[PDB]
Amino acid sequence: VHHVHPLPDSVPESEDLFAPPPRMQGKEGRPKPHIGPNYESYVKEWAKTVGPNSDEWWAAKARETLDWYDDFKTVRAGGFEHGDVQWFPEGTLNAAYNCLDRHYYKNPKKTAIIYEADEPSESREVSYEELMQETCRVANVLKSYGVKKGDAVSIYLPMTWQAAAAFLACARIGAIHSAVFAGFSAESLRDRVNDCECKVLITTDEGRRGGKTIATKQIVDAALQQCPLVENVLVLRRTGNKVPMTEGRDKWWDEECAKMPAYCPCERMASEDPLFILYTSKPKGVVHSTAGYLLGTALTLKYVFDAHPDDRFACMADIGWITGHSYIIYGPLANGITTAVFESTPVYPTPSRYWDFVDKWKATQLYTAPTAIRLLRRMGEDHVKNHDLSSLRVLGSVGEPINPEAWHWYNDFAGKNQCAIVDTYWMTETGSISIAPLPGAISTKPGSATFPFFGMDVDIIDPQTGQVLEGNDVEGVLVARRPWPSIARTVYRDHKRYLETYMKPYPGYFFFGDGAARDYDGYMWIKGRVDDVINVSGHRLSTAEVESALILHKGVAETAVVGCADDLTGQAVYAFVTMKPEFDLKATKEADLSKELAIQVRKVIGPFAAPKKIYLVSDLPKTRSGKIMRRVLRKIVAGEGDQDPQIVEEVKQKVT
Ligand X SMILES: CC(=O)OP(=O)(O)OC[C@H]1O[C@@H](n2cnc3c(N)ncnc32)[C@H](O)[C@@H]1O
Q: Using the 8-state DSSP alphabet, how is residue 267 labeled? A: P
| 426 is an interface residue for ligand X by CB under 6 A | yes
Q: Using CB under 6 A as the criterion, what x/- string covers residues 105-134 for binding ligand X?
A: ------------------------------
Give the separation between CA 115 and CA 124, rounded to whole angstroms.
Answer: 5
Q: Which of 300, 424, 450, 490 binds ligand X (CB under 6 A)?
A: 424
For residue 26, the number of C-alpha atoms closer than 13 Å in the C-beta half-sphere is 7
CA dihedral (528, 533, 539, 543) in degrees, to 10, reads -50
Q: Between the CA of residue 492 and those of 109, 272, 384, 495, what are the distances in Å?
A: 38, 14, 43, 7
Rg, C-alpha atoms of the chain: 24
Q: How far is the CB of 516 from ligand X (least distance, A)?
A: 9
Q: How far is the CB of 314 from ligand X (least distance, A)?
A: 17
Which residues are CB-contacts of 92 (< 8 A; sequence separation ≥ 6)? Answer: 68, 69, 70, 268, 269, 270, 271
Degrees, nearest 5: CA angle 188-189-190: 95
Three-state secondary structure call for residue 171: helix
Q: Cβ of 259: how many Cβ atoms within 10 Å?
A: 10
| 547 is an interface residue for ligand X by CB under 6 A | no
Q: How far is the CB of 359 from ligand X (least distance, A)?
A: 26
- Residue 195: exposed, middle, or buried by beta-carbon count in 10 A (0-12, 13-18, 19+)? buried
Q: How many helices (H) and strands (E) in the chain?
A: 21, 31
Q: Using CB under 6 A as the criterion, what x/- string covers residues 286-325 for binding ligand X?
A: ------------------------------------xx--
Q: Which is nearer to ligand X, 267 or 475 (CB)?
A: 475
Q: Which of 311, 318, 423, 558 binds ligand X (CB under 6 A)?
A: 423
- Residue 11: exposed, middle, or buried by beta-carbon count in 10 A (0-12, 13-18, 19+)? middle
Q: Using CB under 6 A as the criterion, what x/- string covers residues 436-475 for binding ligand X?
A: -------------x--------------------------
Contact window for ligand X (CB under 6 A) among 25-33, 378-386, 509-517, 558-566: 509-517
Given CA atoms 230, 231, 236, 238 in this order, what sign does their dihedral have?
Answer: positive
Degrees, nearest 5: CA angle 190-629-549: 160
Q: How far is the CB of 550 from ligand X (least distance, A)?
A: 17
Q: How far is the CB of 478 from ligand X (least distance, A)?
A: 9
Q: How far is the CB of 400 from ligand X (least distance, A)?
A: 5
List the one residue out of 525, 500, 505 whose CA is nearest residue 515: 525
Q: Which is nearer to ligand X, 162 or 323 (CB)?
A: 323
| 529 is an interface residue for ligand X by CB under 6 A | yes
602 belongs to an annotated ligand binding site: yes
Q: How far is the CB of 653 from ligand X (least distance, A)?
A: 28
Q: Which of 357, 512, 523, 615 binds ligand X (CB under 6 A)?
A: 512
Contact window for ligand X (CB under 6 A) among 15-23, 118-126, 238-246, 422-430: 422-430
Residue nearest ligand X (C-beta atom): 428
| 434 is an interface residue for ligand X by CB under 6 A | no
Q: Which is nearer to ligand X, 281 or 418 (CB)?
A: 281
Give the separation between CA 407 and CA 397, rounded to whole angstroms.
Answer: 9
Q: Which is nearer to ligand X, 152 or 406 (CB)?
A: 406
| 389 is an interface residue for ligand X by CB under 6 A | no
531 belongs to an annotated ligand binding site: no
Q: How far is the CB of 428 from ligand X (least distance, A)?
A: 3
Which residues are CB-contacts of 450 (< 8 A; sequence separation ≥ 6)? Answer: 423, 435, 436, 437, 442, 444, 523, 524
Q: Using the 8-state DSSP alphabet, how is residue 532 labeled? A: G
At 425, which amino acid appears? Y
Q: Which is nearer to ligand X, 65 or 280 (CB)?
A: 280
Q: Which is nearer to ligand X, 424 or 571 (CB)?
A: 424
Q: Binding to ligand X (CB under 6 A): which residues in 251-280? A: 280
Where do the H-state alpha helices sit in 465-542? 495-498
377 belongs to an annotated ligand binding site: no
| 222 is an interface residue for ligand X by CB under 6 A | no
Q: How far is the CB of 369 from ligand X (least distance, A)?
A: 8
Give the separation between CA 122 and CA 444, rounded to whole angstroms.
Answer: 38
# residues near ligand X by CB under 6 A: 20
Q: Which of 186, 215, 245, 427 binds ligand X (CB under 6 A)?
A: 427
Give the separation between CA 278 and CA 269, rounded to whole angstroms.
Answer: 19
656 belongs to an annotated ligand binding site: no
Give the separation between CA 366 and CA 414, rounded to whole angstroms.
Answer: 9
| 622 is an interface residue for ligand X by CB under 6 A | no
Q: Binding to ligand X (CB under 6 A): which residues in 394-413? A: 398-401
Q: How far is the CB of 525 from ligand X (least distance, A)?
A: 9
Q: Which is nearer to ligand X, 143 or 284 (CB)?
A: 284
Question: Which residues of this protein are in contact with ligand X, per CB under 6 A?
Answer: 280, 322-323, 398-401, 423-428, 449, 512-514, 526, 529, 625
For the annotated binding site for ATP, the residues are 281, 428, 529, 627
For the annotated binding site, the residues are 81, 209, 281, 318, 428, 529, 538, 602, 627
